[PDB]
Enzyme design. Structure first.
Site, PDB file in Angstrom:
ATOM      1  N   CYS B 114       0.785  -1.048  -0.191  1.00  0.00           N
ATOM      2  CA  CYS B 114       0.255  -0.013  -0.088  1.00  0.00           C
ATOM      3  C   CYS B 114       0.999   1.391  -0.109  1.00  0.00           C
ATOM      4  CB  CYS B 114      -1.021  -0.196   1.219  1.00  0.00           C
ATOM      5  SG  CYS B 114      -1.553   1.734   1.950  1.00  0.00           S
ATOM      6  N   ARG B 117      -0.360   4.760   2.671  1.00  0.00           N
ATOM      7  CA  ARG B 117      -0.063   4.274   4.287  1.00  0.00           C
ATOM      8  C   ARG B 117       0.541   5.508   5.203  1.00  0.00           C
ATOM      9  NH1 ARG B 117       4.087  -0.451   4.834  1.00  0.00           N
ATOM     10  NH2 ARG B 117       4.417  -0.052   2.290  1.00  0.00           N
ATOM     11  N   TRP B 286      -8.846   5.580  -1.168  1.00  0.00           N
ATOM     12  CA  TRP B 286      -9.350   6.286  -2.627  1.00  0.00           C
ATOM     13  C   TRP B 286      -8.698   5.849  -3.594  1.00  0.00           C
ATOM     14  CZ3 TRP B 286      -8.187   9.573   1.725  1.00  0.00           C
ATOM     15  CH2 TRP B 286      -7.108  10.275   1.765  1.00  0.00           C
ATOM     16  N   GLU B 291      -4.613   3.588 -11.460  1.00  0.00           N
ATOM     17  CA  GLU B 291      -5.300   2.265 -11.203  1.00  0.00           C
ATOM     18  C   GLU B 291      -6.395   2.099 -12.401  1.00  0.00           C
ATOM     19  OE1 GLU B 291      -6.020   1.000  -7.060  1.00  0.00           O
ATOM     20  OE2 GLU B 291      -5.934   3.209  -6.552  1.00  0.00           O
TER      21      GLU B 291
END
Ligand code: HEM
Ligand code: HEM
Ligand SMILES: NC1=N[C@H](CCNC(=O)c2ccoc2)Nc2c(F)ccc(F)c21
Ligand SMILES: NC1=N[C@H](CCNC(=O)c2ccoc2)Nc2c(F)ccc(F)c21
Ligand SMILES: C[C@H](O)[C@H](O)[C@@H]1CNc2nc(N)[nH]c(=O)c2N1
Ligand SMILES: C[C@H](O)[C@H](O)[C@@H]1CNc2nc(N)[nH]c(=O)c2N1
Lengths: 415, 415
Positions: B114, B117, B286, B291
């Protein structure tokens, strides 16, 4: 006690101690590490223990002979026999030219960080194991460069210098690569040329090389033969082909007065084969656009040209969300690609590159059930997922023969 | 015997047998693997052996209490005592709401894949450990979605369902993520919608869900409570916010009739903390432009829109070297970014994203001497080296608490 982590951008370092609180096996993964020890083959003070040599040597020969169709059991047995005898009589042994060629290609095939491995079979091998002086290295290197460059029609090649004997008689090219521009810390505080080559440039300055304080001064060959100190040699300019950067649409691009050398050749790696080690075996392939367009030109720690290519495109260089960076980088990449093509210098885009590798990887898996691959290196520095390899799961292991990294000489060399 | 390698693009599989011929330790690296076992936490037939539970539980509590400044030794001892007692009396134990919140954030912090973070501290926690039926899950999920979406002003959140008891009474969201478009194999042979969700869509069809054969049909929640079979629930459309795709310059962009949901939420992972396991704990953050713009829209195995965005830009879509792909992808990315901003829906570009993480990583290293990081995931699928994290060396290890992957339910579920 703790692991070191480096940020090649800001150069900062961090000490990780938390990993100690990890759990079971899990496929502390050191995958993101640039130079791990598992990929480095260091110095030696004595010959390789015979108990280790003979086995590895035998393995290599069985690989070599088990390599071609229509086996040659006699030659194979004779060679096994011949090699063993040579080891107990000399403490080491010499590879035949064919085995050497075989070793260099297999090592190449076994390079998990190379996306050009579909070419593994096409490799020129210059046998210089008989080399003995720095001056002779310089000559061999020059020949190599000239051969490989081929007036823009790049050809892959490698030259093998004397194999490490006792460890106290190693041939070593101190440079990271054959051709590479220098970087100087100007007196006004600014930095000219390749910011990443600041130290090594100083090392050459310290060894008598005369700085030309330019943006693209080709660094000198810093050669060490047998075991003696390193001698410096400037590369004959007539041998360094370069491409002047120009955009197929923006005429102001060449106003940036940019260019790059056409020959990509690694100089400081070690070739490990059948127990033998070759601390000097410079090799070259050809460029992949993104290397120059993205890494060399856009890395902060390198030429760092993103900001100004941005303004020149009239972009919102002050609003990250605008994605101006993604816009400029692509145009820079196009410049590099366009320029190499226009000046008839071999090069290849990353998309064509990826598909190529995928083909290699499948061929490889059919021929030998595997292909060591470092995903972190195979995925281009732009348009990753737009590439096939990004979606390809890969296994990264060290086979043999193998091209290893080695400790920077200036660190473990006694003058 | 051999390792399996998958090409998520062509879906092909290879059997690697060569790795067996590898050498010494070296930092067979399974780094490029999508779902290794080391990252999966599977089924169970019986409670967790007390001998394993108590230790892990004690560790977690010492972490929790050793977490805040101005320690509370009494509360700490009392809690250690209290928890031990509860384990020998019940065979397990219940976390206090604060410990739960703590566990969810730490697990988040410990998510090496991730890049968001830096937000770890800001997380909403919906306690649904008292849930008991599928209908109640649906309600909880709906609440979550509604909360998180916040009319475009996305807020991170997670809802924790009952912890695994005996392993034969697990709550499980069968979907990979809360919102996700379906994919259908049309009768003319073509594929509509998310090509990657073909199977799961069939699974929903098989469970009574009525296909709408569209390009963007939001799949249904396939919930299984306690241990019973999974029940299907359509998500109330008024809850699925979407962004219509339009370019800030090419008016023909919306002609592509593209759009995407605003809520990115993982649904099938497991939360491991203090020996306890939570097979159902959907969470959301979000979106990061790339992506959608790069993976969802440009992956071959997904919506695959590169080719036509290319022609629409009047590019040489038949000459890889032209770098048309690098050109289109950037424009698509700009579309996504522009559209989310215009429609006031939280989102962030990958450049801003990377710098953000770098900051997190340094803060993390100062606060606790480390930060597990999966470079292969942290580097965006475009402009990799143009990002700081590409030059950052990272260590990837599994800590605890941790969010694990788990085996697809439809594979290990008895109806
Ligand atoms: C035919 C053309 C070839 C192409 C297009 C090619 C391309 C590349 C590229 C793009 C990289 C990444 C470099 C970086 O990120 O710094 C690389 C790495 C590598 N290649 Fe190839 N290569 C070729 C030939 C060869 C040959 C002939 C050898 C050896 C005989 C070889 C050995 C390696 C090794 C060891 C690496 C890793 C270098 C490192 O770790 O710094 N390559 N190559
Ligand atoms: C505040 C906003 C957040 C952002 C911008 C963010 C962004 C991202 C992105 C870009 C990925 C890559 C996804 C992919 O490649 O498929 C990811 C993965 C991940 N994130 Fe975050 N995230 C956020 C919040 C969270 C939260 C709140 C949690 C958990 C409580 C979390 C847990 C994870 C995990 C486990 C992964 C890995 C998913 C997987 O392996 O498929 N993230 N996140
Ligand atoms: N195409 C290749 N790029 C790099 C070597 C060239 N790299 C550089 O010259 C450089 C590294 C940093 O800054 C410049 N790796 C290669 C290799 F190991 C072998 C053959 C090659 F073709 C390449
Ligand atoms: N921004 C995030 N993207 C993905 C989850 C959303 N992914 C999808 O919806 C998808 C995956 C494939 O096709 C679609 N991972 C995330 C996570 F694990 C937690 C929070 C997030 F914010 C994200
Ligand atoms: C094979 C490879 O691991 C895979 O295609 C990639 C790599 N890294 C990734 N990075 C992120 N963030 N998300 C992904 O889906 C992937 N997938
Ligand atoms: C830290 C990270 O490993 C490093 O910055 C990267 C990643 N992968 C790479 N990929 C290639 N091909 N070449 C590189 O220099 C790097 N460097």
């Amino acid at each position: 006690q703790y692991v070191r982590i480096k940020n090649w951008g800001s150069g900062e370092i961090l000490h990780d101690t938390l990993h100690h609180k990890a759990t079971s096996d899990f496929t502390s993964c050191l995958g993101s590490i640039m130079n791990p020890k598992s990929l480095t083959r260091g110095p030696r003070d004595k010959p390789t223990p015979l108990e280790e040599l003979l086995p590895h040597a035998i393995e290599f020969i069985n690989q070599y002979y088990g390599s071609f169709k229509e086996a040659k059991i006699e030659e194979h047995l004779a060679r096994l026999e011949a090699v063993t005898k040579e080891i107990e009589t000399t403490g080491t042994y010499q590879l035949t030219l064919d085995e050497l060629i075989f070793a260099t290609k297999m090592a190449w095939r076994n390079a998990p960080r190379c996306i050009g491995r579909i070419q593994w079979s096409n490799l020129q091998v210059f046998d210089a194991r008989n080399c003995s002086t720095a001056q002779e290295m310089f000559q061999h290197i020059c020949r190599h460069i000239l051969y490989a460059t081929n007036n823009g029609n790049i050809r892959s090649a490698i030259t093998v210098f004397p194999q490490r004997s006792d460890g106290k008689h190693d041939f070593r090219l101190w440079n990271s690569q054959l051709i590479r521009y220098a970087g100087y810390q100007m007196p006004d505080g600014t930095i000219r040329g390749d910011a990443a080559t600041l130290e090594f440039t100083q090392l050459c300055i310290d060894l008598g090389w005369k700085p030309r304080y330019g943006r693209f001064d080709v660094l000198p060959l810093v050669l060490q033969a047998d075991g003696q100190d390193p001698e410096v040699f400037e590369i004959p300019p007539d041998l360094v082909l370069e491409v002047t950067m120009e955009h197929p649409k923006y005429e102001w691009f060449q106003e940036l007065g940019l260019k790059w050398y056409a020959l990509p050749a690694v100089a400081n790696m070690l070739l490990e084969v059948g127990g033998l080690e070759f601390p000097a075996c410079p090799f070259n392939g050809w460029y992949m656009g993104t290397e120059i367009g993205v890494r060399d030109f856009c890395d902060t720690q390198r030429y760092n040209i993103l900001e100004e290519v941005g303004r020149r495109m009239g972009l919102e260089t002050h609003t990250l969300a605008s994605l101006w960076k993604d816009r400029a980088v692509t145009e820079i990449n196009v410049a590099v690609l366009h320029s190499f093509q226009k000046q008839n210098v071999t090069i290849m885009d990353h998309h064509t590159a990826s598909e190529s590798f995928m083909k290699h990887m499948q061929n490889e898996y059919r021929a030998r059930g595997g292909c060591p691959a470092d995903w972190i290196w195979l995925v281009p520095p732009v348009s990753g997922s737009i590439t096939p390899v990004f979606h390809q799961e890969m296994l990264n292991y060290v086979l043999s023969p193998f091209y290893y990294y080695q400790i920077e000489p200036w660190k473990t060399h006694i003058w």
